[PDB]
């Protein structure tokens, strides 16, 4: 009784993408499946639904134009063919199964892990690493700017300093270019005798830059 969505996906504006939700461990054709999308920092939204049999398909007002849902009971597989994608449609897509009702209602007990779909349509570029110097307990940091796409992994001295470390969530800019910030707090005395180097590992852009932090005047 487990569902498996698509691992990772990336697209462009008005682009076409297929999300495949595999189903196993319990009878498929008996029940009716549906898609539900979650935008970052937003509540869930109902996308599309298909009857357990497949005769009836249902779409939402916003998505009815540009989306298409389809199923094969033999392969026990659910396909969401997404056309004419927009920036608003960028989300994590979950595929679920019915809670109590049998092909009658749209209850959901068991959810898939989700499939990430991103329609940002920005050229993939290496992050710019800018260090933040300490004043005068003291705080210091590193700033990642104009990077795309997610993710970015941040480590201190290749992970040597695990404690007292804060990595903030990524933020969307108007330019459509993400920016992230990571900081650490250490005693005032230890700053001079120790060197702090931040490691940014960005796989898509293959950008691995290590930037040392010094408090100079």
């Amino acid at each position: 009784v487990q569902l498996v969505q698509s691992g990772v996906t990336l697209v462009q504006p008005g682009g076409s993408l297929r999300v495949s939700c595999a189903a196993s461990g319990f009878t498929f054709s008996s029940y009716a499946m549906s898609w539900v999308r979650q935008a970052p920092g937003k509540g869930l939204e109902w996308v599309s639904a298909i009857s357990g049999l497949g005769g009836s398909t249902y779409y939402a007002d916003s998505v009815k134009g540009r989306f298409t849902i389809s199923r094969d009971n033999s392969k026990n597989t659910l396909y969401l063919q997404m056309n004419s994608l927009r920036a608003e449609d960028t989300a994590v897509y979950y595929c679920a199964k019915d809670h109590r009702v049998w092909a009658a209602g749209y209850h959901f007990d068991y959810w898939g892990q989700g499939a990430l779909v991103t329609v940002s349509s920005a050229s993939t570029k290496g992050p710019s690493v800018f260090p933040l110097a300490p004043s005068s307990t003291a705080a210091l940091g590193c700033l990642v700017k104009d990077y795309f796409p997610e993710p970015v992994t941040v480590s201190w001295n290749s992970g040597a300093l695990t404690s007292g470390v804060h990595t903030f969530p990524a933020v969307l800019q108007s330019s459509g270019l993400y920016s992230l910030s990571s900081v650490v707090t250490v005693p005032s005395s230890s700053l001079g005798t120790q060197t702090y180097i931040c490691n940014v590992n960005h796989k898509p852009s293959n950008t691995k830059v290590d930037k040392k932090v010094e408090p100079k005047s």
Partner: protein
């Protein structure tokens, strides 16, 4: 169409406390309603169906009630696994989700640490200037940060982010970024960040002079 609403968006609670969330629909959807649970980064999990019948494998402490327009989710005893976002769904009309009620454990009041950083020199070489104002180790979560440049408020040019509660210390952290052009940065000399929080009797402000 029909949209439901939630009363507590963020509810401050502690372990083993009786918790009640109230979800009232615009129209009367009778007995057809459901409640869900989503932990950070985890798939949504089914709490209750028809507002009366409980799903299998679900802890017995949770209960739900109400009919017609009114509905209430009640937890007699709260547990470490109960801190996640909660929504309400009605099948009478358009499948619709509530704003959600996030559960937190910030009973303790902490004073925010304020650190203000000027834009780095390489960034100045890029032609872009970003000033960063840092708030660290503060619960409660609510806070308000204003940017003041030469005793002048700046609106729309600020971007803000909040980390999740840390398991060890239970403290949230917030960052505010003010982004401006090289020219706009160099024209104004003094940059200041004003922090308004509960922990502090007087709202504290940290500032720097350009090129100092």
């Amino acid at each position: 169409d029909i949209v439901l609403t939630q009363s507590p968006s963020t509810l401050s609670a502690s372990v083993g406390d009786r918790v009640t969330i109230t979800c009232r629909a615009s129209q009367s959807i009778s007995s057809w309603l459901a409640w869900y649970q989503q932990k950070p980064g985890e798939a949504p999990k089914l709490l209750i169906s028809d507002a009366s019948s409980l799903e299998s494998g679900v802890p017995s402490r949770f209960s739900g009630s109400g009919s017609g327009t009114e509905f209430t989710l009640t937890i007699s005893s709260l547990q470490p696994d109960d801190f996640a976002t909660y929504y309400c769904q009605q099948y009478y009309s358009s499948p619709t989700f509530g704003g959600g009620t996030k559960v937190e454990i910030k009973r303790t009041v902490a004073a925010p640490s304020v650190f203000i950083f000027p834009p780095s020199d390489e960034q100045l070489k890029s032609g872009t200037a970003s000033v960063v104002c840092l708030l660290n180790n503060f619960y409660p979560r609510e806070a308000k940060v204003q940017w003041k440049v030469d005793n002048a408020l700046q609106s729309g040019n600020s971007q803000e982010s909040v980390t999740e509660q840390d398991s060890k210390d239970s403290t949230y952290s917030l960052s505010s970024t003010l982004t401006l052009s090289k020219a706009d940065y160099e024209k104004h000399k003094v940059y200041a960040c004003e922090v308004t929080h509960q922990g502090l009797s007087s709202p504290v402000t940290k500032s720097f002079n350009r090129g100092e």
